[PDB]
Paper text:
The proteasome plays an essential role in protein degradation and is critical to maintaining cellular protein homeostasis. The mammalian proteasome core particle, 20S, is a large, barrel-shaped protein complex composed of four stacked heptameric rings, including two inner β-rings flanked by two outer α-rings that are each formed by seven different α or β subunits. In each α-ring, the N termini of the α subunits form a gate preventing unregulated protein entry and degradation. There are three types of known endogenous proteasomal activators that bind the 20S to open the α-ring gates.
Endogenous PA28 subunits are known to form two different heptameric complexes: a heteroheptamer composed of PA28α and PA28β subunits and a homoheptamer composed of PA28γ subunits. Previous crystallographic structural analysis of the mouse PA28αβ heteroheptamer found a stoichiometry of four α and three β subunits. The protein complex for this previous study was produced by heterologous coexpression of the two subunits, which form a 4α/3β assembly reportedly due to a more thermodynamically stable α–α interface compared to the β–β interface. A more recent cryo-EM study of heterologously expressed human PA28αβ mixed in vitro with bovine 20S also made a similar conclusion. On the other hand, the PA28 4α/3β assembly derived from heterologous coexpression showed only partial association with native 20S when assembled in vitro. These results suggest that PA28 in a 3α/4β arrangement may have increased binding affinity to 20S compared to a 4α/3β configuration. In this study, we report a human PA28 stoichiometry of 3α/4β, which is different from the mouse PA28 stoichiometry of 4α/3β reported previously. Our attempts at studying the native stoichiometry of free PA28 by native mass spectrometry proved inconclusive, but the data do not discount the possibility that multiple configurations of PA28 may be present in the cell. While our study indicates that PA28(3α/4β) is the preferred configuration that engages with the 20S proteasome, it is possible that PA28 could be present in both 3α/4β and 4α/3β stoichiometries in the cell.
Numbering used by the authors:
A (entry chain A): 3 to 231
B (entry chain E): 2 to 240
C (entry chain J): 1 to 197
D (entry chain B): 3 to 251
E (entry chain G): 7 to 245
F (entry chain F): 5 to 244
G (entry chain D): 1 to 241
H (entry chain C): 2 to 236
The structure:
Amino acid sequence: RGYSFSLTTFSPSGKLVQIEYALAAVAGGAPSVGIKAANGVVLATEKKQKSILYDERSVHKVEPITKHIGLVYSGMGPDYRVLVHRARKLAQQYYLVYQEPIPTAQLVQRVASVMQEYTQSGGVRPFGVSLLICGWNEGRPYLFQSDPSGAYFAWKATAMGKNYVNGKTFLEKRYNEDLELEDAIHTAILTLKESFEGQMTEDNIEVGICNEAGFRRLTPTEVKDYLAA
Amino acid sequence: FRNQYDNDVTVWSPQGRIHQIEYAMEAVKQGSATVGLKSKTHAVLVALKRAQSELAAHQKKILHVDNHIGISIAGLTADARLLCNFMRQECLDSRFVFDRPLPVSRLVSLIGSKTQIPTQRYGRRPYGVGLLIAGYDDMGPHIFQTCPSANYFDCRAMSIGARSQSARTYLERHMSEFMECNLNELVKHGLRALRETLPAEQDLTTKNVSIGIVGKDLEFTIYDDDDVSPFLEGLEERP
Amino acid sequence: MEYLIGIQGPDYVLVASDRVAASNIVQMKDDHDKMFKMSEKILLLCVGEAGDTVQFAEYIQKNVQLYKMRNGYELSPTAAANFTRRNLADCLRSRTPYHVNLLLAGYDEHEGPALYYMDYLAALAKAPFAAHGYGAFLTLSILDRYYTPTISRERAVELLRKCLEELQKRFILNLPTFSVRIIDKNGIHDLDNISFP
Amino acid sequence: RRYDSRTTIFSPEGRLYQVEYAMEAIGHAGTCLGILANDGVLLAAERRNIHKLLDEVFFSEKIYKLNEDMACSVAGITSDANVLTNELRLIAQRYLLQYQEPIPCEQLVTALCDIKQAYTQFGGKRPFGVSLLYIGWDKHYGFQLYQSDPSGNYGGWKATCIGNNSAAAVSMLKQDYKEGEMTLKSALALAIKVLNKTMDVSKLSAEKVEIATLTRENGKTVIRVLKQKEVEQLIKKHEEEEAKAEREK
Amino acid sequence: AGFDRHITIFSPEGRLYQVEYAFKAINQGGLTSVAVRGKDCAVIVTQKKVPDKLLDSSTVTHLFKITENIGCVMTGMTADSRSQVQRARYEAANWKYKYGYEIPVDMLCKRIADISQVYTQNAEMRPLGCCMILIGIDEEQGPQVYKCDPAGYYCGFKATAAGVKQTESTSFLEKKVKKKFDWTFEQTVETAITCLSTVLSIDFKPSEIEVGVVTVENPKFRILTEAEIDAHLVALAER
Amino acid sequence: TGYDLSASTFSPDGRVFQVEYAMKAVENSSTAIGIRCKDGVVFGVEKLVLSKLYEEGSNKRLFNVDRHVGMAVAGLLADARSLADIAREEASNFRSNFGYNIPLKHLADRVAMYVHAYTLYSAVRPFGCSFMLGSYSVNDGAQLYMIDPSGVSYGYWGCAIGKARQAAKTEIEKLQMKEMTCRDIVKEVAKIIYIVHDEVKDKAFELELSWVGELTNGRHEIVPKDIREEAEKYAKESLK
Amino acid sequence: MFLTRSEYDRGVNTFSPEGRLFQVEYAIEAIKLGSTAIGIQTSEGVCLAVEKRITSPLMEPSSIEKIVEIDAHIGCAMSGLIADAKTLIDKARVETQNHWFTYNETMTVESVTQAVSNLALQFGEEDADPGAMSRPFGVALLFGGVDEKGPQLFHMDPSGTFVQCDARAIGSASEGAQSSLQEVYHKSMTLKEAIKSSLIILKQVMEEKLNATNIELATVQPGQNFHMFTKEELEEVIKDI
Amino acid sequence: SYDRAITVFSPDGHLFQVEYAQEAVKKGSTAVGVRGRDIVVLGVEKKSVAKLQDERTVRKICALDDNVCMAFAGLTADARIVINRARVECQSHRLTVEDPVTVEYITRYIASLKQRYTQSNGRRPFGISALIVGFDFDGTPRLYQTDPSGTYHAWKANAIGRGAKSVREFLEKNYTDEAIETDDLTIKLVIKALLEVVQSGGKNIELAVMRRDQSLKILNPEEIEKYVAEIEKEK
């Protein structure tokens, strides 16, 4: 009824419906999986393209906010770019003020605060993208998810996007805390494999790894090797 | 239904008509009639004032913008008071800046621009006062009418207000005579034309008629209750 | 040109000020009071450029009073000092610097007697005894010579009287009468004006 | 018809429904409990999140340290909470800069509550949907526990629970709490007992609860989140104590 | 429903219907545009339909030059298209002023696309209903083709189409890229014309098509003259 | 269906109806025609005389937007006068900053962009006026440009706006205007204006003619009454 | 046959088919909710009278203030929402004072009404200023004063229109009081007759029996400044009735 | 129809949202004020202890300044904002005119704040009605009441809040010059009146007296017990 349309209106039952509707957008998004291994965090997502015509090198689902922090998204694509840019900017502001790379937890709190701001005003629409943010700070791997609501949770492993619920179950069954990243990247490709609905190919999937060295996107050749397994 | 398309000035109707502007135009009809006519040397405004009660004084229908320009209001008085102030300030501004009486035509263009902005933007209602503006400038006597819609027209003569068609009819038939008329004749012709608007029982009285005259040698003057007596006495009886 | 002196003690703070307000050379008032009571147990004594003194003092007095009404507990003497300093400091950078020199004296049940000194530039220092004014130069030494951290109230008024008599003997300006008040756990208590006829 | 939208329309009968609707949200949230004891004040919360793949990176999910002398627990929309906690931390730091003394506990609560009232009065913003318990020691009133509501109305409670099954907890607390006799040790026990009844899980996981205690030691307040081993001992002690009463029965 | 009617509201299934409605507008124009990228050249071809003989053919164009070396074809509402072209031209110059080098095509699409997201997230404005395809040569990466849609998506494509027959056009192009032979300038132009012609079944004459090309040898965007278009068209028929 | 209430909205089929509704407004107004010949551009408006009371040579629908450019408007007159003001301001600015008379193609574009802005936002309604601008400069040539309420701007060799636009275009089409000279076109414009006017529906019309070209030395000016009178005679005779 | 759709009434800035701007009209109706106030202007002076409508004996009668002094020369009797009157009485008080400061003279009653009227007209969202009430004001004020032209009574309405009235009644019983006023008013009446006549009309319109407490009466004769009859004076006049 | 916006006026010229805010005041706890010759007494009912709730935090009666005290009935949070704003003004007047605020000045200020909220949509009327008691420079006792609308009136005695109608009737009959003759008698009258509406006895009434120059004193629960006892005994 009336509660559904407004974003500043709590429904009888105290649910802000437009945010719930916004989360539904993320669910419709392409599957994305994040596993936090002891030595690293692997972020991977499906980049399935409608046609061979699309040039894959042009746009990347997995992006680097800073040398040690990288993010993947499930949801509305235009929105991801806005958040990524604000994130890249928020980090540079930390560097200028404190001259130290931003701790990952700090960026996720800051990006989330931006998301909450969009939620408050009637004029704007909540962002429809959820971000998985992975980083290596203080010799420790970190993985975090920020939902359109503005809430950040820390996940040892999680999957967002289509078939998220099934993905999480597969991961809970296959997750070992002591896993090394080389094993973990394999676990992730398997998790995506569950819902791919097509032959996975190097182009169809995009994967990124965070370690002491810092966030990097595995190039297509490297993934082909991992897929060969 | 078509209840929709009438709520705001910002909604165009399926057939190209902005209804609120039209509804605003209807406001002028609600007001008491006023007649304006021009002669080669003079411009005259005559008005039929209305009174809330016998004890109450008749309202002011003719207001002086400047020595060379004066207006008669038909419609919501509030909109008129606001527009008149804008006009007065625009005239005062010209004298301070250029030391010239503002050309009457230029003022009407400015009233039109101010009036149009409410029509296209959500927010302020369209002004619902209809104004007859009369002035003598170097070009000559001028009579202009302004609709609640910002459109403005230059007229040999015009009557705006309730039952104003009757006045326009008289004015059209006797129009040719007006150009060469003397001032007394011109006001007399006008008083007769507004008489047509009046209900048959009602008659022009010193109390309900206001005459404003501006001319090459006459600064706009509003002859009022006892000073309309010279112009009214010469008039005859109802046809 | 105006003298403020305060002597802290074991259980009391004694504060005194000249009662003269003057124009170029005419001493318009002989009974100006430069002590403003911020709270039952806090007194701010202010000397400085004319106008700025009354204006800053009143603002601080009212703000301190608002705290009392709003929270029900009076501000601690130390807190008030920090508050006045913040305000004066903020203004120093601004185009409207209040040129005021202040001494704040208060008794807090928990922290005992306290005397704070702030200069126009807004430095705050807690001090055992302090004075502001050209007179201070002449009298600070007398206090330094005869002050014991354990001074008794009777001894303190005596020390203050000695300090003031020097101003009569050597200071060029004529400050004839002084107002003296003591803050103790009981609260601000007025003491007789020490007047050198 | 509908006098319940916009937060600025009083209903015939004078009720602001949007605030009431907001209060409903706190009910869905995980239970948080605070008990005031002569020695210290404690906040214990139920970490509703129990998904196996979640990491305890933070000091606490629901207990936040507003200032050296005070702490808060939040129940309600998490995003709204993050905004309020940031504000509370700034409000406190501003008092310290201005008066160079720690913010009195009631004042921090009164100020946040004022931000919460404003959101209700002005038209565009939704009323904040969070209810939070503040625990702190102030020189003026010693140890104090305060509960806040989306309305902006705050109260001082010796013990209270906000969130799911709050009513059951208050009833249990009403009989169990002994005024003037509580000690942190006894209170931590009361907390485990009430939490056990309110939470659906038969056994408190000891990973499903977070308990934080504020005590003044050596003249400086210490807010410590009890580590899991400490809580596990408390759960075992309760399990045994209740079992012994059942064994007697 | 009512889930549609405001861009900001999200559908119960999170679909932001208004943005989708805008993509429909591009088709309402009834024109299709095809862009193909060769080894050394990038070409944009669009159908030019002149509704009336009176209209000057020179004025009607969907091909605009964002900067000397970047060219764009905008399909959709004509007015919205011109608006985006200006923003692009402003953005292109602002990059040269601030950063000192010509904007890379990808960055122009990114900036233009990002502007579109703001419209998609803010309540008052409507997503502009136009799609812009930019062709440019980047020294590092050779020829580039990028399309920005009303949503804010900015993907770059080896070949792409926009308009009524986009799906059919994409299929034809897809078959031709899959049997990759690489494309010389002539082939890149020929492939484009054959694709537009086959999907529309038009059998085009030089006047009906506007073709724009960027080449590594001559990087500047040039709109081919009717004679040049005819030469390629004649060759296609001959073979 | 709530799709047509605002211009921000887009109909499910992709059409912004409020703009289309605004375009219907111009059809309510009387026809106005502009023809571009080699020497210059001639514009004509059939100005209906609603009442004898209204002064002749007033209620003009042809405005001079700058010394070298003239505007003929059809549609809600109030908006048109306001659009004319926007155009005049733009022309002044181009002279003030760039130091020369505005190229007409640019002027059309700048005014069009202003008109288009109204199309996007929900606070303001689309403008209800369709206007034609024409100028002759020796360097530029003779240019006629027409702007719809949508903000689409295109250059027309010959153009018509108003209630009888379709009928007028057919007549304008048989003119071979490019070869024709400015003086001859004034007679032709009148013939078309007379042909389109419907005597039964519209009681009477006064033809207002304006022209810019080599003859006017590139200044848009009202056609001298002698020339207008000769043309009105040519038209009535042709109407037969 | 009933067509009661309305649908143009809600929301100022909306003109009804027939151009009636109903919200303003409804505001004029509000003054009928208010207590009746009657003003008679006579050569001797202008007299203003109002019915207090005291709800409970505990409420102090003095506080109800339906007749107030804008300045010594001009006074106002207000009927309608008390609160919006307070704003309008304040604009008037400042404007009379501003005129003394700028021109060292006393504003005529008409100018003061024009001044308050200008504020009332602003309800239309005429100005861009945030601090202007969107709703038309719900008060009608009768302003009476001795000026250069002698005793004058002007009546102002929520629309903002103002007119001189020899006698006017604003309020619940204005219709009917006005009718009676029309019969009783003669230009020549002295203020003493008017005070008696106005109080006679009020006694008839008021539900409660007239008592000094229930009525407020004021006069501004040319020599004197605004004067409010005290209970003793009121008792003498009411006794005469 | 005409009840959804503060700005809209109903056919019949009633602004409904302001009236509805006045309904909110009725839901609030009762408060009674009696203007005695030398003492003004303000008394408010306390809803309940709740056992585990500290009572210091909940205070209906507050001192705006040394000479002015206010009691409120209505949404509690709004009262805290109005009370705070009044306190800033009291101190600000002292800064601007160097003189203590008269009871009426504070009443007018509080009223204007409320009217300001009623005047524009986008703000909700404060749902509080307040009794402001004070002693003026002349020393006359003054009691004023304010309502969400912004109307201020002076009442010799008044009750706001739930049951106000019943107490006000009791006060009308009970109030007399004789009752206000003794300061104790004045305190007794308010206690007796609140007793009429309070479900419980003295345990649920909080009462405070302001003397001619003394500061507001909230009577200790024991002092209240003594008064209720004298009243009960006399019954």
